[PDB]
Paper text:
The fungal class D1 G-protein-coupled receptor (GPCR) Ste2 has a different arrangement of transmembrane helices compared with mammalian GPCRs and a distinct mode of coupling to the heterotrimeric G protein Gpa1–Ste2–Ste181. Ste2 is a homodimer that can couple to two G proteins simultaneously and its dimer interface is formed by the N terminus, extracellular loop 1 (ECL1) and transmembrane helices H1 and H7. Here we determined structures of Saccharomyces cerevisiae Ste2 in the absence of G protein in two different conformations bound to the native agonist α-factor, bound to an antagonist and without ligand. Activation of Ste2 requires both the removal of a blockage from the G protein coupling site (H7) and formation of the binding site primarily through the inward movement of H6.
The antagonist is a mutated form of α-factor with Trp1 deleted and the W3A mutation added; conversion of Met12 to Nle does not affect signalling but makes the peptide more resistant to oxidation. The antagonist adopts the same hairpin shape as α-factor in the orthosteric binding pocket, but makes contacts with fewer residues in the receptor (20 compared with 32 in Ste2–Ag–G). The structure of the antagonist N terminus bound to Ste2 is linear, with His2 forming a hydrogen bond with Asn2055x29 on H5 and Ala3 interacting with Thr274ECL3 in ECL3. Upon antagonist binding, the side chains of Phe2045x28 flip inwards by 180˚ (7 Å inward shift of the Cα atom). Lys2025x26 has to flip in the opposite direction to prevent it clashing with the ligand, although there is only weak density for the side chain in Ste2–Ant because it extends into the detergent micelle. In the Ste2–Ant state, the receptor transitions from density maps that lack signal for the N terminus of the antagonist peptide to maps where this region becomes discernible, whereas the C terminus of the peptide is clearly visible. The intracellular end of H6 in Ste2–Ant is kinked outward away from the receptor core by 38˚ (12 Å shift at Cα Ser2436x35) compared with its position in Ste2–Ag–G, and this section is also rotated by 170° along the helix axis. By contrast, in Ste2–Ant, H7 is kinked in towards the receptor core at an angle that differs by 47° from the active state and the residues Ala2967x56–Ser3037x63 form a random coil. The position of the intracellular end of H7 in Ste2–Ant overlaps with the position of the α5 helix1 of the α-subunit Gpa1 in Ste2–Ag–G and thus sterically blocks G protein coupling. Notably, two putative sterol molecules reside at the kink in H7 in the inactive states of Ste2, but not in the active states; the sterol ergosterol is known to be important for Ste2 function.
Numbering used by the authors:
A (entry chain A), B (entry chain B): 5 to 303
C (entry chain I), D (entry chain K): 2 to 13
Amino acid sequence: APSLSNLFYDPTYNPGQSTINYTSIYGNGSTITFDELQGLVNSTVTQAIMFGVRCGAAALTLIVMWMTSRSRKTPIFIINQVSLFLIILHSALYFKYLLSNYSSVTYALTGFPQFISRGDVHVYGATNIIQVLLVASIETSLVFQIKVIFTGDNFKRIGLMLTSISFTLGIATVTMYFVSAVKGMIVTYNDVSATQDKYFNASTILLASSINFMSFVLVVKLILAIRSRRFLGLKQFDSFHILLIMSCQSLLVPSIIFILAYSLKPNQGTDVLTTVATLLAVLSLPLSSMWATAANNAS
Amino acid sequence: APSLSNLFYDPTYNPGQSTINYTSIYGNGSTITFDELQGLVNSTVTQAIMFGVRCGAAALTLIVMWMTSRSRKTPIFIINQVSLFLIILHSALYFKYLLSNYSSVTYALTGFPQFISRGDVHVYGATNIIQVLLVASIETSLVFQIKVIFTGDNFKRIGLMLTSISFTLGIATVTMYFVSAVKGMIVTYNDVSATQDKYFNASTILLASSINFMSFVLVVKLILAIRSRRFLGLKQFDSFHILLIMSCQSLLVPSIIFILAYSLKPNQGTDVLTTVATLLAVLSLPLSSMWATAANNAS
Amino acid sequence: HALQLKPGQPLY
Amino acid sequence: HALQLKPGQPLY
Ligand SMILES: CC(C)CCC[C@@H](C)[C@H]1CC[C@H]2[C@@H]3CC=C4C[C@@H](OC(=O)CCC(=O)O)CC[C@]4(C)[C@H]3CC[C@]12C
Ligand SMILES: CC(C)CCC[C@@H](C)[C@H]1CC[C@H]2[C@@H]3CC=C4C[C@@H](OC(=O)CCC(=O)O)CC[C@]4(C)[C@H]3CC[C@]12C
Ligand SMILES: CC(C)CCC[C@@H](C)[C@H]1CC[C@H]2[C@@H]3CC=C4C[C@@H](OC(=O)CCC(=O)O)CC[C@]4(C)[C@H]3CC[C@]12C
Ligand SMILES: CC(C)CCC[C@@H](C)[C@H]1CC[C@H]2[C@@H]3CC=C4C[C@@H](OC(=O)CCC(=O)O)CC[C@]4(C)[C@H]3CC[C@]12C
Ligand SMILES: CC(C)CCC[C@@H](C)[C@H]1CC[C@H]2[C@@H]3CC=C4C[C@@H](OC(=O)CCC(=O)O)CC[C@]4(C)[C@H]3CC[C@]12C
Ligand SMILES: CC(C)CCC[C@@H](C)[C@H]1CC[C@H]2[C@@H]3CC=C4C[C@@H](OC(=O)CCC(=O)O)CC[C@]4(C)[C@H]3CC[C@]12C
Ligand SMILES: CC(C)CCC[C@@H](C)[C@H]1CC[C@H]2[C@@H]3CC=C4C[C@@H](OC(=O)CCC(=O)O)CC[C@]4(C)[C@H]3CC[C@]12C
Ligand SMILES: CC(C)CCC[C@@H](C)[C@H]1CC[C@H]2[C@@H]3CC=C4C[C@@H](OC(=O)CCC(=O)O)CC[C@]4(C)[C@H]3CC[C@]12C
Ligand SMILES: CC(C)CCC[C@@H](C)[C@H]1CC[C@H]2[C@@H]3CC=C4C[C@@H](OC(=O)CCC(=O)O)CC[C@]4(C)[C@H]3CC[C@]12C
Ligand SMILES: CC(C)CCC[C@@H](C)[C@H]1CC[C@H]2[C@@H]3CC=C4C[C@@H](OC(=O)CCC(=O)O)CC[C@]4(C)[C@H]3CC[C@]12C
Ligand SMILES: CC(C)CCC[C@@H](C)[C@H]1CC[C@H]2[C@@H]3CC=C4C[C@@H](OC(=O)CCC(=O)O)CC[C@]4(C)[C@H]3CC[C@]12C
Ligand SMILES: CC(C)CCC[C@@H](C)[C@H]1CC[C@H]2[C@@H]3CC=C4C[C@@H](OC(=O)CCC(=O)O)CC[C@]4(C)[C@H]3CC[C@]12C
Ligand SMILES: CC(C)CCC[C@@H](C)[C@H]1CC[C@H]2[C@@H]3CC=C4C[C@@H](OC(=O)CCC(=O)O)CC[C@]4(C)[C@H]3CC[C@]12C
Ligand SMILES: CC(C)CCC[C@@H](C)[C@H]1CC[C@H]2[C@@H]3CC=C4C[C@@H](OC(=O)CCC(=O)O)CC[C@]4(C)[C@H]3CC[C@]12C
Ligand SMILES: CC(C)CCC[C@@H](C)[C@H]1CC[C@H]2[C@@H]3CC=C4C[C@@H](OC(=O)CCC(=O)O)CC[C@]4(C)[C@H]3CC[C@]12C
Ligand SMILES: CC(C)CCC[C@@H](C)[C@H]1CC[C@H]2[C@@H]3CC=C4C[C@@H](OC(=O)CCC(=O)O)CC[C@]4(C)[C@H]3CC[C@]12C
Ligand SMILES: *[C@@H]1O[C@H](CO)[C@@H](O)[C@H](O)[C@H]1NC(C)=O
Ligand SMILES: *[C@@H]1O[C@H](CO)[C@@H](O)[C@H](O)[C@H]1NC(C)=O
Ligand SMILES: *[C@@H]1O[C@H](CO)[C@@H](O)[C@H](O)[C@H]1NC(C)=O
Ligand SMILES: *[C@@H]1O[C@H](CO)[C@@H](O)[C@H](O)[C@H]1NC(C)=O
């Protein structure tokens, strides 16, 4: 401590509007303010909290489902039980990504391609392959729940066609995710500082569409379970409607978060919303799968 | 893009060893390298993942304990059920702390006290009060488990004295945490840029001591449960020893993490270890509390 | 349109 | 001795 400056005695001095000087690819003359630097740092600090919550939740959901189940060997159980595992693997390679040189303040401010090695591109590839192997599990789970809802003593007209639109939506979502992934990889392998992003913002809309369709079909099943019982002389539900509708026996909360995630402009946390809604969908599949295979009028 | 510099065509150029120029309290002449800046940013990115895992785990442990219990109204249940709530409240005010100006790169590099307002000091106070209201719950849980293990048909010599050493250790841990907290608050309220830290590194050693004592007492109970049965003609445990010892029916894993956390020098992740071991202790209290109240030789 | 990815940021 | 706190960092 040789000597303090005079600005130490200024009550109204504002650090954050001060100047930072650095050398970039455009020479030794780039400048930035401390608040744009802090805005770059606060978005990494905000995207690590979410994925740590995801890893925690999914690990403690996997164990609890292993310990609290009566009827194992069911396909729906196995698919629900590997989706929670691909969530944890996706979150692991993203923590690997978040501490690497592709997410550094060095690359961000100074766009030098010498800072990117081979090994940073292979974890990007691997993460883009686990993201599509997770969407495929979600879609196959939804198509088995739909295939178990209406098949049976119910009318075969509606039931046979709703599995068709759900198989169609699932295969289209998976194919579009695969296309997006394989082109992004080509682009990145050609140039490290290149971005290809027109196919990620329609894959999310089709995942959202398929979840909204599952919510519609479960609401349909509930209205027909309140309509069939009154025709006969059997007693109705006392306070089961509130549990089914409100708690996520039907996928209404993830569906609302999805419809507010892409309708709203990006400046209102649109990236914080899809990440919460994918977690809530994968966490709500065990609860949507108990109502789906339940006696409509036998009980 | 007016013109790229010549350093864009240098294969061996190393960004990260370049110079950053900024104005500090010691004038308009401070300098730093991109790797010490990135080392400041990577420790915030590493301390947000842990607390997001903590918030996730504790929230999904609270719900599951609410839903999967037969004998409620027990004090041990209520204490175990409020410790998981104080973990979530502690993690909430730390996310509040992590996005505030006391954890910014601006304050870190430029130590200007004009950047600290009143409201940043009150969340520091509140967090230091929830940390001691969490240690108090941990200690009271351990003293009720010890008070339920030996009290009964067992000999009253050892049992009456082990509750005494456990009450003593708990009250000493809570008192030392309170002392640390109240002096740190005085210091910080006097000067925002002042640090008082001699009492935090003995409070952790006494929390670790009390957990190690609980592990010793549970190992004792297990050796006496294998020794009493053979004296009589009753059948022994078939494969129950492996579950008890290995899985955290006794608190051996948190105890090992605690004994490697402070014995090792700080340069080997000593801060990443105590934060995992507090989570594992609070998550292992429900499992240590079932073995503690179990029939020693009746079953 | 609503989600923008960084040059090295994988899908989420 | 083994854990060091920042001037504004609360207890953990
Ligand atoms: C719920 C339980 C049963 C999970 C069991 C699996 C764990 C043992 C795994 C899951 C996630 C893993 C972590 C994921 C990511 C990392 C970062 C990784 O960091 C690096 O070495 C690369 C980054 C860098 O060098 O800067 C070190 C291992 C670690 C902590 C892993 C350690 C092992 C963990 C905790
Ligand atoms: C839990 C089950 C599903 C197994 C999970 C396996 C993954 C953890 C493995 C399988 C393939 C591995 C990848 C295969 C190849 C590479 C390239 C490798 O590139 C290098 O820099 C290595 C050296 C070189 O070849 O130059 C870096 C690790 C990585 C991404 C591996 C990371 C770890 C992965 C994803
Ligand atoms: C999901 C559970 C069951 C397992 C999780 C394990 C992963 C967290 C581990 C397993 C394989 C590991 C990888 C194995 C090898 C490498 C290469 C290693 O070195 C390089 O990339 C080359 C040098 C360079 O970076 O230039 C960096 C860490 C990485 C990606 C590891 C990151 C952490 C991985 C993915
Ligand atoms: C769940 C576990 C078992 C992982 C399942 C997926 C893996 C089998 C995939 C995912 C990412 C793939 C990697 C992505 C990219 C590459 C680079 C690729 O490079 C080239 O073909 C040319 C590179 C060049 O010269 O530019 C070689 C295969 C490899 C390592 C792939 C090997 C197979 C991987 C590990
Ligand atoms: C688990 C399922 C989804 C199958 C995964 C198969 C992978 C092993 C395949 C699928 C996409 C493939 C990639 C698609 C495109 C390319 C670009 C290709 O061309 C170049 O990067 C050099 C030429 C140029 O693009 O200029 C090199 C192989 C690579 C990485 C491929 C490596 C092998 C990949 C990862
Ligand atoms: C649920 C059943 C009845 C199927 C209904 C079909 C819809 C799910 C499809 C049909 C037309 C699709 C749209 C056709 C074109 C576009 C433009 C496309 O433009 C972009 O924003 C991409 C490029 C960019 O990111 O700028 C975004 C998706 C969107 C709205 C698509 C969203 C999904 C839609 C509405
Ligand atoms: C309850 C079930 C049966 C509904 C299934 C159909 C929906 C999933 C589809 C039908 C109409 C679609 C919408 C048609 C047009 C648009 C506008 C498009 O963006 C814009 O062009 C406007 C941008 C803005 O307003 O900010 C984004 C997708 C969206 C909302 C689509 C999202 C998907 C929707 C709601
Ligand atoms: C499924 C049941 C248990 C209900 C769970 C509650 C969630 C649906 C709520 C609780 C907290 C909410 C969040 C609280 C604060 C914000 C910040 C908010 O940010 C802004 O609008 C301004 C800042 C920005 O642009 O990012 C965006 C919505 C979000 C993520 C909220 C999204 C909805 C959340 C996750
Ligand atoms: C440091 C590690 C051990 C922590 C891992 C997370 C734990 C907090 C979780 C993981 C598995 C959970 C257990 C999984 C299954 C059960 C059985 C369950 O049993 C009943 O519902 C009782 C049935 C009856 O009494 O008939 C009670 C909760 C419990 C012990 C759970 C309590 C919370 C546990 C230990
Ligand atoms: C910050 C601190 C001071 C407050 C923390 C929240 C409390 C207001 C909560 C947390 C745990 C709750 C307790 C958890 C469990 C029970 C058992 C419960 O037992 C029943 O009568 C219902 C179950 C049964 O039939 O056995 C009665 C409420 C009570 C004491 C709860 C009362 C409210 C408590 C103390
Ligand atoms: C465990 C469950 C019950 C959730 C607990 C959440 C609390 C820890 C959060 C929720 C709302 C928060 C408050 C919301 C808003 C503010 C104003 C905020 O004002 C400021 O000085 C900062 C913002 C600004 O500069 O205007 C200070 C923190 C405080 C009291 C927050 C303190 C932490 C609170 C109480
Ligand atoms: C038992 C489980 C289901 C949790 C239920 C409680 C939630 C509704 C609480 C717990 C933690 C809370 C969060 C803790 C911290 C923050 C940061 C807070 O940020 C600020 O306003 C100040 C810091 C900043 O953003 O700069 C906004 C509210 C939020 C997202 C809180 C929203 C409400 C949450 C998700
Ligand atoms: C979880 C249950 C038991 C409720 C407890 C939540 C606490 C963590 C909250 C509730 C009320 C909050 C307080 C409400 C108001 C203030 C004043 C506030 O004053 C300021 O300097 C900021 C606002 C301003 O500029 O006036 C500082 C935070 C503080 C002490 C808050 C700290 C966090 C508190 C104690
Ligand atoms: C009855 C059974 C369970 C044995 C329990 C032993 C502990 C209650 C005692 C034994 C030795 C004590 C330690 C001996 C010396 C020190 C160093 C001492 O150093 C300091 O940090 C304070 C002085 C300084 O600032 O240099 C702090 C207390 C501590 C850890 C003591 C904490 C309490 C310990 C672990
Ligand atoms: C009943 C069983 C489980 C024993 C419970 C007590 C221990 C957990 C305590 C008692 C005395 C404590 C020790 C007392 C003093 C020290 C010295 C202290 O600093 C040093 O002097 C180490 C560096 C050096 O000088 O080489 C580090 C902790 C340590 C080993 C303590 C570690 C924890 C110990 C072994
Ligand atoms: C029953 C369940 C709880 C078992 C799960 C396994 C844990 C006991 C392991 C898995 C990952 C491990 C961590 C992986 C990496 C590190 C970093 C390591 O720090 C280092 O020396 C390297 C990093 C650095 O400090 O730069 C300290 C131990 C720690 C926290 C490990 C502590 C023990 C952990 C949590
Ligand atoms: C930073 O910005 C420009 C770049 O040359 C220069 O005029 C200015 O003097 C620099 N400030 C400091 C403290 O170096
Ligand atoms: C910046 O770049 C020019 C051109 O290479 C060089 O002469 C000069 O030394 C550098 N530094 C300053 C402060 O101008
Ligand atoms: C920053 O400080 C260094 C001395 O370490 C000096 O050489 C340089 O001219 C200053 N300005 C810039 C833009 O680097
Ligand atoms: C740095 O501080 C001195 C003293 O106020 C001032 O004269 C000068 O303009 C500042 N910038 C440089 C490059 O010296």
